[PDB]
Structure formats: C-alpha cells, structure tokens
Design an enzyme around this catalytic site. Sequence first.
Site, mmCIF file in Angstrom:
data_model
loop_
_atom_site.group_PDB
_atom_site.id
_atom_site.type_symbol
_atom_site.label_atom_id
_atom_site.label_comp_id
_atom_site.label_asym_id
_atom_site.label_seq_id
_atom_site.Cartn_x
_atom_site.Cartn_y
_atom_site.Cartn_z
ATOM 1 N N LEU A 17 33.152 16.389 -9.337
ATOM 2 C CA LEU A 17 33.103 15.268 -11.021
ATOM 3 C C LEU A 17 32.020 14.846 -11.348
ATOM 4 O O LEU A 17 31.852 14.379 -12.237
ATOM 5 C CB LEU A 17 33.630 13.954 -10.025
ATOM 6 C CG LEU A 17 35.212 14.077 -9.748
ATOM 7 C CD1 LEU A 17 36.333 14.723 -10.923
ATOM 8 C CD2 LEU A 17 36.028 14.911 -9.043
ATOM 9 N N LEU A 60 19.727 0.523 -2.352
ATOM 10 C CA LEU A 60 20.828 0.739 -2.749
ATOM 11 C C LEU A 60 20.650 2.215 -4.199
ATOM 12 O O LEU A 60 19.228 1.888 -4.418
ATOM 13 C CB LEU A 60 21.670 -0.423 -4.173
ATOM 14 C CG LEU A 60 22.386 -0.578 -4.498
ATOM 15 C CD1 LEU A 60 23.738 -0.450 -3.696
ATOM 16 C CD2 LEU A 60 22.586 -2.052 -5.927
ATOM 17 N N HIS A 76 23.534 -4.362 2.212
ATOM 18 C CA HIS A 76 23.618 -3.089 1.132
ATOM 19 C C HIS A 76 25.479 -2.305 1.960
ATOM 20 O O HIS A 76 25.842 -1.695 0.493
ATOM 21 C CB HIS A 76 23.115 -1.256 1.628
ATOM 22 C CG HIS A 76 23.272 -0.369 0.526
ATOM 23 N ND1 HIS A 76 23.811 0.866 1.474
ATOM 24 C CD2 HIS A 76 22.722 0.186 0.003
ATOM 25 C CE1 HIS A 76 23.985 1.788 0.173
ATOM 26 N NE2 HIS A 76 23.262 1.771 -0.198
ATOM 27 N N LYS A 135 22.294 2.533 -7.602
ATOM 28 C CA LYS A 135 21.586 2.283 -9.027
ATOM 29 C C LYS A 135 23.025 3.239 -9.977
ATOM 30 O O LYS A 135 22.197 3.452 -10.956
ATOM 31 C CB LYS A 135 20.756 2.147 -9.259
ATOM 32 C CG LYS A 135 20.705 1.658 -10.289
ATOM 33 C CD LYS A 135 20.786 0.117 -10.674
ATOM 34 C CE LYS A 135 21.113 -0.854 -9.961
ATOM 35 N NZ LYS A 135 21.466 -2.156 -10.214
ATOM 36 N N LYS A 192 1.172 -0.843 -0.338
ATOM 37 C CA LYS A 192 0.170 -0.178 0.314
ATOM 38 C C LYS A 192 1.074 0.995 -0.056
ATOM 39 O O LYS A 192 -0.082 2.109 -0.452
ATOM 40 C CB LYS A 192 -0.845 -0.022 1.185
ATOM 41 C CG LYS A 192 -1.672 1.456 1.140
ATOM 42 C CD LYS A 192 -3.191 0.975 1.783
ATOM 43 C CE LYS A 192 -3.353 0.401 3.790
ATOM 44 N NZ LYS A 192 -1.522 0.339 3.801
#
Lengths: 469, 469
Positions: B396, B177, B237, B179, B19
């Site tokens: 960077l 995570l 993680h 990605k 939900k």
Amino acid sequence: HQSDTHIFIIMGASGDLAKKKIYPTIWWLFRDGLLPENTFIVGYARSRLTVADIRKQSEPFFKATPEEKLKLEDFFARNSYVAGQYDDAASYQRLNSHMNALHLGSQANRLFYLALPPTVYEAVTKNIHESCMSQIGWNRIIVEKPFGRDLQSSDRLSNHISSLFREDQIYRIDHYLGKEMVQNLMVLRFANRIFGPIWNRDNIACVILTFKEPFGTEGRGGYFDEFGIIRDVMQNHLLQMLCLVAMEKPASTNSDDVRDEKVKVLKCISEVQANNVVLGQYVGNPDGEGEATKGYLDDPTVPRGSTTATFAAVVLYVENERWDGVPFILRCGKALNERKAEVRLQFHDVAGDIFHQQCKRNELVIRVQPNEAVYTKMMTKKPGMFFNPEESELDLTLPDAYERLILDVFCGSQMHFVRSDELREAWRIFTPLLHQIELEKPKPIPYIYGSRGPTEADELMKRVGFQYE
Amino acid sequence: HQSDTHIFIIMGASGDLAKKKIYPTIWWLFRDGLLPENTFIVGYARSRLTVADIRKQSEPFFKATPEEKLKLEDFFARNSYVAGQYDDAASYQRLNSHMNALHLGSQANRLFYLALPPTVYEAVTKNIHESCMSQIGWNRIIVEKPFGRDLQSSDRLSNHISSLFREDQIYRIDHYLGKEMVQNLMVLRFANRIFGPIWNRDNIACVILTFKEPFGTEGRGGYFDEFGIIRDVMQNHLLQMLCLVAMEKPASTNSDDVRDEKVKVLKCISEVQANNVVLGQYVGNPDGEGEATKGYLDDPTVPRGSTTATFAAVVLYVENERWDGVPFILRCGKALNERKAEVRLQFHDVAGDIFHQQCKRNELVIRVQPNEAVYTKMMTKKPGMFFNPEESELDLTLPDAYERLILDVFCGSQMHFVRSDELREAWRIFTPLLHQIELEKPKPIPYIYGSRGPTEADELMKRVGFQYE
C-alpha cells in the site's frame, strides 16, 4: 468433460459469425487441448459446401502457424459439413442421421450453437426439440442476443423456449462478458471483511458501470438500427454487472443461488421513467482520419431518419434494506474515445472532515478489458515532511473472454447466463421506456465520434450524486 | 522557524549518549539544513573539555565525507562547550552568562536535551527553572526515559515537572518511534471509508503490536536490570501504538485533541493482571557465533540472580462502546530473530462462508522498521479456470526517524509526546503488575537468543483469538 465425446454444432456455418468468431475460437480451443479430447464440429447451412471450402474461407481468420500446422490438420480431421434448410424436417432428420453416423453419436453430448438470424429461432428451436434431442447425453442450446425486442416479444420467446427446453438447457450467451474480472468481483466482494460491511447504503455512495469500445458500427449498420444499444449490450451486460454489484450474499457458490439473488435484486427495482434516461447517437468527425469522418446516419445500409440511439445512460435504484436509495448509473456506448469496461464504486465521505477538506471519495475500479486489472484509488500520506494525503492508484490483482465463455458452456457453469425469469425482470424494468421510445420516436442528441459520450450522462451522474475529480 | 535563532543544549555532553547518538544526529540535521539557519549547539557536562576534544572524540561516529568536509567546520563553528556540575548554582549562572554571551542569546529559543543519569532530574530541572529561563522566546526540555519506576515515583516526577513547566514545555521523547508509518496510520484510518466504518468491535478480530530487536544489551548490561523491558519500550512505544490504533476520532488534527482522545482511551482501560502478562529473559546460544553465545545473566555487569525481563507480552482491552471486548496484543523484546516493528490488524471472517472454508482473515500490516511499508495480505482469485482465491501480498505504500523526532521538538508539534495525564493513566494501568512483580520476584521464562520468543506469548495470542495461517 474429457472422456465423454462432445460435438459442437454450428447452425449457420456459412454465416459470417461462424466464419469470423466461432471457427477461429473453436480452433484456438482445440490447439491447446482445452476442448474435450473427442471433439467433433458439425457445420450447418443452406448452400452446399465442403470441408475444403470451409478451410479456404476460414484459414485467413485462423492466424495459423507452421509450428502447429499439424494441429490445424488434426483440427480439420474432426470437421464435417451438413447442408439443409432450417424450416424443413427432411434436412433435420438428415442431420440427425449424419450425427448418429459417428463414434457414439447417440451417446455424444450435443452442444448447439445458433448463429442464425433472430427471426428464425422460433422455428429452429421447435425443430430441434422435435428431432435433435439426445436420449443418452445432455442437450444444451446457445441462443444469441437479442432475445426479443420488448416485453411481449421477449415473454413469448422465453415461454416458447421454456416449453421446449428446461432452464438448465438454455445458455443465453453474452459475448462481452470478460468472465475473468467479473469473476474477480465475486471474490473481492465476498472474501473480504474490509469491503463487506461497507457494501451497504451508508458507505457506497454510487455505482458506475461503463462499457466502451473505440470502433463504431462499420459495415453492419442495418443490424443495429432495429435493435439499439439498450437491447444490444446494456440490458444484458450492464444489467449483469449491476446484479453482480448490488446482489446479496449468495447462499453458496452455486449458479442457481447467485441467479436467485439476481432475480431478487431486480425484483427490488422499480420502473424506469423517461427522466432517468439519456440517449445519444454518434456522428462523423470533420477532423477525423479514418471511419471517424463518416457517421452512423451516413451508413447507406442505415435508413434515413432513424431515431435509434447507440449510447444509453439510465440510473437504477435497488430498493431494499441493503440498497435503499443508492444510485446505480449505467454508461454504455459505441464509437467512444477509449476501449474500457470498468465498475467504479465511489464510497461516501467520512463523517467529519479533519484534513482541511483535502479528502476525496474512495474508489474501486474493476477494469474488465483491456489490461484486466483491479485497483483502489485510495489516499495515503505522501512521503516527505507533512501530514496531507495524496490520491493514489494501487493494483489489487490465459484464454480470451469468448473462448472462456464457450469453455464454461462445455462445463455447464451457468453462473453468468441470464435466466428466463431474470430476463423477464430486465424486460419489464424497461418496458415503459421502450414503449415510449417506440411510440414517440425521441431524437438522441448527436455526440462526437471518439468522444467520452454526451455530456447529459455526466449531468445525470452529477444530479444523482456522482462526484468528478 | 528559520529566522529566530535556536540553541541545542546537550546536558551531558561528555556522556556516551551525546558522543554516540545526539551529536551525530544533530550534525546530520545540520548538513541538510534541517536545523534553523541560526542554530547554536552548547554542550554541557562536568569534565573540563574543549571543542577540539569534542571533535576528536566525536568525528569517528559522524561518518563524514570529503564532498561536504567544509560543512564539518561549518558545524563546529556553531559548537560550544561549558563545564560544570549538575547541582550547583554557580555553574548554572555561568552557563546562563555563556548563553547570553551570544547573538541575541536572551531572545534565542533554547532547546535542552537531558541525557544525564535519571537520578539527577529532580534537581537539574529545578535549577533550570531557577536560572535557565528565557524571557523572550519559547523554552522546552527533553526528559529521557525512564520517567520514574512506579506510580508514586512517576506521579512525584510529573508533579514537579508540571509545577516547573506547563505541559506545552514537556516533551517525553521516544527514540524507537517511527514518525513515518505512525504518521501514516492516522491518514489510513481517517481518509478512507474502506477502513473507516469497519473500524469498530464488529469487524476487527484483534490488534497485534510487535517490536523485536536482533541484538542484545551487550556492554550496557547494568542499565536494563533496574528498569525492565516494560518500563523501557512497552510503557511508552507500544502503548503509543495502541493509542494511535484505538483512539477515537479527534475533533481536529491538533495534538491537543489527539492527546485528549489518548486520555479518553487510556481512561477506558482496566488494570493489568498477571494472567494477561508473559515475561521472558534471553539466554545464550550453544550454537551461536558472536554475542549470541552469551546470555543476559552471563554479562558480568548484570547482578547474579536478576529477575528482570526482556520480553513483555501484555494484552489490553479498551473497555468502551467502540472497542468493547476486542483484543489488543502488545509484544516487545530484545535480541529476537529479526528486527521488526509492526502493527498487525486482523479482521473478522465474513458472516457466512461460501468459498468452501478457504477464508483467511484480512491483514493490514504496518511495518514501522525495517523497510517502511503497509501491505494488506488480502486474498483474491488466482488466474486460471478455478473459482478460488489465494493469499496475496499487496503493498500500500528521507531522514531517519530520530532526526524528525528532534525536529518535532524544534517545531513545537507535540503530536507524539506523552501528556502528563496520559502518563499517569499509563502508570496506573501497569501499577498492579509492576507492584506484584516487585513483591513476588517472578522468574521470566528463558528463551533462545535470536529466536521468535517464548511460546507463552504465542499461546497468549491464541487464547485471545489471534489466528496463525
């Protein structure tokens, strides 16, 4: 250097260099108090002049403002003029008497800036050592390039100047040395473990040292013909860049240690052959607008049939354990497309490609001028939904360069002035090439005014290993 | 994967997770076409409900807009609901019949999401293997953490899931995570020789893996006690972050070789001792404003006298040739001062200091969240007359992380899902630690809610060699 009075002695005050680049620079120094508080300026030349005439011929080049017109008046409250010949003792004792007729003139530290013809140094320096040597304060001398023409001439000049003054008193000055980004190379090379271990054979693929300015040799064409670009900029400025790129870790920050590393590096470089040299000369542009339509050989003051190159590309190898077999390329030239002075450091490709041959050799650009900045052309994954990388330029980073250099001359910082032995290294490096040039009179290949330089320099870079994106 | 129809089956549709985080995420995917064109959503749970009820209880968490209100009914034209128990064959045959009663349902690629209580996996996965297998397309499942409690339970679970599905069909997902920065670490690691060859023992001082959260565990306090922070985030993680940092160069960019290197590095890690661990529990703030006034032990759903930790500081040393003896620090916690997910890479001081001991170790921060960015806190010369550097910030451097994490299992790219062997090594490394904790019942150090964490972790960093500026 703010309590002991200093005197800036311009030999050749009526000279064009003193009129355009020395007096305006010293005035810009005096306006913002960068000079020592008790600063005197003494002009010296042949024809009889006065401070009023100096003002008349110097004010247009000053770029003066009414806000500090009072500072300008204070500037000319410190100026004086002495007239005399350069090869007579009477004028020099008169100059000594005039200089001593000042506020602690004997105690005053004299700083001699020679703006004289190159053929007259041999007598000027000798008479200086005879008459104008301070017995209280230090004596420093500034000689202007070139310091000779070949190995024997440079050796005689250096030996004479060394027998006259110790190496601590000689400042072989280099006009184009930025001193701000060249100073940034030192920090960016020692203050990082990121760049440290990769500063060796296995990582740095090659080194590119480039020096370009957009204008040519307008007017003063007869001065370049006998000297050439190699003796003009590349033997001094480009080799200074090469030393500060390839040198070892100095034992300290000290100038003598850095220059010892310079001497060792050039000692670890073998002779230059004819096949490691490319020479070029610029010619007028039929599609040019201003001076581009008129070439170097088209200058009336330039003798007809002159084989003096203005673009020189020579590759160097610093053969020692840290730099064995690595390329060092030197691109210098006049009247080229863009004003630029950068040090580009292409690194080796990573052993083993995993990105489907989409990797590019990483770069490190150190642009001295214009727009002083340092950036690394490394690659990261571009934002989106994939894994491929993209090349990107990422920025890594006040008086002008010439004014900062004269400031350094006051401060005694000889970090970036070429040594006597350093210059001897540099001269025997090119003695075979210079001798062969002066014998055979090779013809440099014409190149287009405002272009990027002859394609033979690019051929040299590709042949030695440089990669073009 | 935009022509073959897909099914997104949420087992546990009535659940709070479905939900709150599952349905809003799939809806956000569908509004932008991130899901395949012919995608079906099949909610499954025990309580009898309807699509209208799902709409009513899920609309407030969608954050819909009048601009794309039409996409709401487009989304709910693809929804369906099936009610049944989790351990009965009749319900699962009815679910299979429901799925087959669709446009190419047998051909349809089905993608489950086990968001049900973990106590049911052993039976639900078995019933899935018995009934819910597609004989045409690919079949994948998503098992939610924790993946067992100790080495034996984890091994039993992994063995059962391996006997059911091959490792290609097992996706052990991780919500936290990123990605994006995780995906950028590999390219920054491999496409550069600036960071490539210095990426070994001799240069990297240490590695820091920090993961902090601003909020506690209000509401769901009865779920953290049985699991612990180590089994919550540190196990998956931060360990994945350590693996991405420390893994060897893969033969290619495929997940097979990447996870092979993961397995090798995991095999090159010794067991964790109690002296290499710091554990803490958060307590309420007398000076707090909202939830900060109540600690973990003050939650009524938390059993009294609970010794479950919420702060984990565990240091690993990947014992092989490339990383012998270098520190790898892992810090994670709940209810800290600021949200942060960073990977800090400090390099060694250069061999031989020459800047009068003004050296600060070069840092390469990879902030996963918030404000995704990589910035190297390196030091470069400050503008001015002085030859000194300053520590300076050099940067960077799109759907959120969870959306592309789900797109990962849609696309079949298993780059960031832990393998069975990797999981077994992960559980072996932490097995002595967890067994000692479960035996002796240690008391975690109480630490301030919304602080940086207990000083024991900082002392751990200091002991292992991490430097604070």
